[PDB]
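Case study B.
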Amino acid sequence: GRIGESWVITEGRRLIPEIFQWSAVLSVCLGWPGAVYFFS
Amino acid sequence: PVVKTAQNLAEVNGPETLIGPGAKEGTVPTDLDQETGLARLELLGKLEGIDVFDTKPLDSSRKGTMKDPIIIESYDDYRYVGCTGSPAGSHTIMWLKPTVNEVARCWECGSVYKLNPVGVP
Amino acid sequence: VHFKDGVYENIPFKVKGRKTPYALSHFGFFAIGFAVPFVACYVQLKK
Amino acid sequence: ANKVIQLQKIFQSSTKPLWWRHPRSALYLYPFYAIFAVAVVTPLLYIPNAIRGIKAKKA
Amino acid sequence: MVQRWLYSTNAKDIAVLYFMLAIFSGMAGTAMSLIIRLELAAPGSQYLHGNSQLFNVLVVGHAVLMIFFLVMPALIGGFGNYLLPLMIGATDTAFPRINNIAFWVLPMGLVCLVTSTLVESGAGTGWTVYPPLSSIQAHSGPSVDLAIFALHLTSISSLLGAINFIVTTLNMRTNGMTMHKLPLFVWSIFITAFLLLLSLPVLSAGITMLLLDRNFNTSFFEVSGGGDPILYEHLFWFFGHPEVYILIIPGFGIISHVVSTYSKKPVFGEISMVYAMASIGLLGFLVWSHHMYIVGLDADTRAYFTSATMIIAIPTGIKIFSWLATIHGGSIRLATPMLYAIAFLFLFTMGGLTGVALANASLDVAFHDTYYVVGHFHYVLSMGAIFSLFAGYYYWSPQILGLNYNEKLAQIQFWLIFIGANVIFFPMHFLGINGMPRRIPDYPDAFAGWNYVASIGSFIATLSLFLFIYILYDQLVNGLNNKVNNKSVIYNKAPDFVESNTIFNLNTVKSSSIEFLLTSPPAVHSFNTPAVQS
Amino acid sequence: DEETFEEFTARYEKEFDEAYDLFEVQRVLNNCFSYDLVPAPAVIEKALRAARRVNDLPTAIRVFEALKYKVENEDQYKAYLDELKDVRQELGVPLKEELFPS
Amino acid sequence: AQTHALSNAAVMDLQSRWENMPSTEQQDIVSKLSERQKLPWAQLTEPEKQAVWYISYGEWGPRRPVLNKGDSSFIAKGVAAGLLFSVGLFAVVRMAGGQDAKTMNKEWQLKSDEYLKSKNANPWGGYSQVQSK
Ligand code: HEA
Ligand code: HEA
Ligand SMILES: CCCCCCCCCCCCCCCCCC(=O)O[C@@H](COC(=O)CCCCCCCCCCCCCCC)COP(=O)(O)OC[C@H](O)CO
Ligand SMILES: CCCCCCCCCCCCCCCCCC(=O)O[C@@H](COC(=O)CCCCCCCCCCCCCCC)COP(=O)(O)OC[C@H](O)CO
Ligand SMILES: CCCCCCCCCCCCCCCC(=O)OC[C@H](COP(=O)([O-])OCC[N+](C)(C)C)OC(=O)CCCCCCCCCCCCCCC
Ligand SMILES: [Cu+2]
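Model:
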C-alpha cells in the first residue's frame, strides 16, 4: 500500500532505468574511437 | 496679448505665454515669478502638495473586488496597473488591464475592473 | 517625433524601394560580412 | 529686450528648420566643411591609386 | 525622418541599433576566426604565406573585436534600456544626449581600430598589452594609439550607460515597489553596472598611462629605466575578471527571467540568492588575482589568493542547483528557450568544473599557460556569451517585433551550433593533457586530426551563421505567414491540464511584468501612467 | 516555511461564495491541484459542485481525470479507485468506457 | 434553444476536422452546445460528449504543441543537409587550395619516427604513426 507501492520506483531507479543513462553517453565510444581508426 | 495674473492652479496653459519681467535693483525675488518656463508651477505644486504626475499610491491595500473595484484617474485608452492582493505582498505581481471593450479578471481576486474617465462636455 | 506605431518602422531601414527591396542593401551586408578579413589578407598577402 | 520678443513672434509665426539663426555661419561652415573636407580626405587614400593593383605575384 | 536613427531620444531604437552593430561585429569576427582556423587547419602555408606578424594581427583582431564589439554593447544595452526603466513604470529614460554621444564616439573607435589593423606594422600582442610585449619597437606605427583611443571611448560609453542605468534604478523607482524583492534581472544589472563603474576607470587610467608612455617616451612600465609592468598587468587582471563577471551576470539574470516566465514556478531561494549575488558583487574585488600564481609572489600570498578563489566559487553551484529546482516539479516545454538554457547550464557546469580544476595553485605550476587554461576560458566565455545572446534573441524577438519566428529553423540552428561546439570542445581535454603549444602559426603536425575536426566545427558554426541571417530574412519576409499558420510558435508557454481553452485564451500569460502583454513597441511616449503594484 | 494550507482552502470557499462564472472554478481548481496537498473527498466534492454550478460536463471530465492523474504519490491507485467510484456513483458520469478503448 | 434529439451532421463533423470548417459557425455550434448542457445532463449521447470535450479541452489551436505532424524529420534532415554542405564546401575549397607541401611525406615521417624511437630510453618504442597522405 503506502509502503509497498513506495518502492516501485524508489529502489527501482538503480537497475531498471540505468540503461537509459548508459546509452545517453554511448555516442563517445562509437564516434571518437571510430574516427581514430578511420584516420589512423 | 495681455498679462496674466496666473494666481489659479488651473488657469495657466502654455509655458510660452509666460516670460517673467526682470528687476532693476534690490534682492533676489521669491520662487513665484523669477522662475522661467513652467517649472514654477511644478515647484509650487511640490511645495503645497497639489501635483500633476502624482506619485501618490493608489488603493493598493484595498482588495478592489466587484463590490468596490479600484479607480484609475486617467483618460488614456490603455492601462498599465497591477493588483495581487490586499497586503503589501502575498504572490508574484500580475498586471491588470481595465478596459471598456471587455472585462478583466485578477486570477487571485477575480476582480472586474472598470476604467474611470474624467468628465467631459 | 511621436508618429511611430512600432510594427514595422522600428528597424533602421526603409522597406520601400524598387531598386532596394531589401535586396541590394542586404547583398551589400552579405559582401561586408566577409569583406574586412579578405581585404585585411589582401593588403599584406594573397587570398 | 526689444528684439527677443520680435524674434519669438517671428519663430511662432514661421516654423522652419535650421532654426533660422546662423545663416552666414551656415554658409561659412557647411559648404566649406564639405569642399575642404573632400579636399583633405580624398588625397590620403588616392595617393596609393598608382600603387593600387597588387596581385601578390612575384617571380 | 533621420533624427529617429541618429538622435534617438527613445531607448528602443538605440537598443536595436546596438544589436545590429553587435551582430555585424560578431559575424565579421566569426568569418575571420573561420579564416584563422583554416590557417591552423593544417601546419604550413596553404592559404597564408606564413607571416607570423600577420597571424598575430588577426589573432588580436579576433580577440579584441569579439570581446569589445559583440558581447558588450547589445547584451547589456538592449536588455537594460528595454526592461530596467520600462518594467519599473517610468515614462521615459533620461540622458538621450549621453547615449547619442556614446554612439557617435563609437565610430571613432571602429575607424581607428580598422586603420590600426590595416597598417603594415599593426599591433599583434594579443589580448595582453603588457609592455615590453606591446612595445612600439616591434609593433610600430599608429596601431597602439588607435587601439588606446578605442579603448578609452568604449570605456566612456559603457561607464556612461552604467551611470544612466544606476540613476534610473535609484530615482525612477515606482512608489509601489519594495527594494528587497526586486527581480533577479534588476539586481543583476545593478551589480553589473556597479562592478563596471568600479572596474572600467582603473583600466582606463592604466591605458592612459600606457598612452603617455608611448607618446612622451617616458619610463613607467618598460624594463629599462626601473619600470614595473606588473602594475599594469594587475590592473588588466582587475579589469578582466570583473569584466568577465560583467559579461556573465546579465546572462544569469536573463536565464533566470526566462525560466521564471516559462516554468510557471518561482525560483528556489530567490531572495536568498539576491543576497548571494549582492555578496558576489561586493566580494568580486578579492578574487581578481588567481592568474598571477607564477609571477613571483610569496607562498602566503598564493595561499590567500587560492583560498579566496575557491571560497567564492560556491554560489555558482548554488545557482546551478537553484535553477535545477526551478525546473523541478514544474512543466518544461520542448521550446527553444528551454533547450538553450539547458545547454548553456550544462556546458557552464563543465566550464566551472575545469575552473575548479584550475583553482589549485600547486597544479597550476604544471598547468598554467598549457592548453588547459585557454580551453577553460574558451569554454566559459564562448558558451556563456554566445548561448546567452542566442537565448535572448530567440526569447525576445516576438517581444520587440511581434512577428513570429519559425520553430523548425530555430531547432535546426540550435542543433548546428550545439554539435559544432561539442565536436570542437570535446578533444580539448586530450589536447590539454598532451600540451599543444599555444599561439603558433605553424604548430607540430601531431594534432592534425584534432585541428581538422576543430575546423569542421568552425565551418559548421559559420554555416550556422549563414542560417542565422537567412532566418532573419525569412522572418522579415514571412512574419505575416508565421502569424497566419502554425509554422511558428504562437504562445510562449503551453497550458496545463487544469485550464479550459477559453480560459487559457483569455489568460495566455501570467508573468511578473506587463511587457509580454504590452503591445508592439508604442511611440516614444509610453508608460504615461505610473505602475502600481501590491 | 511549512505554512498553513487550510487558509487557501477557506479562500477557495470564500471565492465560491463570490463565484460568478466557470473562470473562478478553473482558477480554484488550478490553485488547489498546484499544491502538494492531496484533496480530501470533502474538498473534492466542493470543487465538483463548484464546476457543476454552471453544469458543464466537460469540467466534470476534467476534474475526474485530474483526480485520476493528480500526483504520483508513490503510485496510489486503490484509494484513487474507490474515491473515483464514489464520486461517480454520487451523480453518475460514465466516460471511462469511451476514451480508454482507443 | 430548447432542442430535442440534437444529433445532426455537425456533431460528427466536428470530430474529424475543425480548422477546415470556416470559423463562422464554430461560435454557433459552441453556443448551441452550451445552451443544451445548461439543461440537466441526463447522460448525453457519446458523440455530443466527445464533440464538447474536443471544443473545451484542447488538442487544437493553442494546445497545438511544437511537435507537428512530421517536422522532426525536417529537423533531422536539415541538420544532415547542413553537414553535407559543410563537407562538400570543405572538399571544394581544399581542392581549390592546391598543393602547398613539398616536404613531410609519409617517408619523411617514417624516418623521423625511426630516428626518435631508436635510442634514448624510448617509452616502449612510441606510437607515432604517419597521419595520412
Ligand atoms: C569572448 C570570448 C571568446 C569567444 C566567444 C571566442 C570564441 C572562439 N574563439 Fe577565441 N579567444 C578568446 C576569446 C573568445 N574566443 C581570447 C581572449 C583569446 C586569446 C587572445 C589572444 O591571445 O590574442 C582567443 C583566442 C583564440 C585562438 C588563439 C589564436 C591563435 O593563436 O591562433 C583561437 C584559435 O583558433 C580561437 C578560436 C575561437 C573559436 C573557434 C571560437 C568560436 O566559439 C566562435 C563561435 C562564435 C559564434 C557562435 C559567434 C556567432 C556570431 C553571431 C552573428 C552572433 C549572433 C547573435 C545575435 C546578435 C542574436 N580563439
Ligand atoms: C564564465 C566565466 C568564468 C567562470 C565561471 C570561471 C570559473 C572559474 N575559474 Fe576561470 N577563467 C575565466 C573565466 C571564468 N572562470 C577566464 C577568462 C580565464 C582566463 C584568464 C587568464 O587566466 O588568462 C579563467 C582562468 C582561470 C584560471 C587561470 C589559470 C592559470 O593560473 O593560468 C584559474 C585558476 O585558478 C581559474 C579558476 C576558476 C575557478 C575556480 C572557477 C570556479 O568558480 C567555477 C565554479 C563552478 C563550480 C563550483 C563547479 C560546478 C559546481 C559544483 C560541482 C559545486 C560543488 C563543487 C565545489 C564547490 C568544489 N580560472
Ligand atoms: C547532391 C545535390 C544536393 C543535395 C543536398 C540537399 C539539397 C536540398 C534537398 C534536395 C532534394 C533532396 C531529395 C528530396 C527527395 C524528396 C523529399 C521531399 O519531397 O522533400 C520534402 C520532404 O521533407 C523531407 O523529409 C526532406 C527534407 C528536405 C530534403 C533533405 C535533403 C537531405 C540530403 C539529401 C541528399 C544527401 C546525399 C548524401 C548523403 C549524406 C521537403 O519538404 P519542404 O522543405 O519543401 O517542406 C516544407 C515547406 O514546403 C516549407 O516550409
Ligand atoms: C543557380 C541556381 C540553381 C538552382 C537552385 C535551386 C535550389 C532549390 C532548393 C534546393 C533544391 C531542391 C530541389 C527540389 C526538391 C523538391 C522536394 C522538396 O520539397 O524539397 C525541398 C527541400 O528544401 C528544403 O528542405 C529547404 C531547406 C534546405 C536546407 C536546410 C539546411 C540548411 C543548412 C545550411 C544552410 C547554409 C548553407 C551555406 C553553404 C551552402 C524543396 O522545396 P521546394 O521549394 O522545391 O518546394 C517543393 C514542394 O514540394 C512544392 O512542389
Ligand atoms: C555515424 C555518424 C553519424 C550519426 C548520425 C547519422 C544520421 C542520424 C541517424 C539517426 C536518425 C534518428 C531520427 C530520429 C527522429 C525521427 O524521425 O524518429 C521518428 C520518431 C518520430 O516520432 P513518432 O511519434 O514516431 O512520429 C510518427 C510520424 N509518423 C510515422 C506518424 C509519420 O522520433 C523518435 O523516435 C525520436 C527518438 C529517436 C532519437 C531522437 C534523437 C536524435 C538526435 C541524436 C541522435 C544520435 C545518433 C543516433 C544514430 C547513431
Ligand atoms: Cu577570479
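Residues 16 and 22 of chain C are 8 Å apart (CA to CA). The remaining cases will be described in the next quarterly update.
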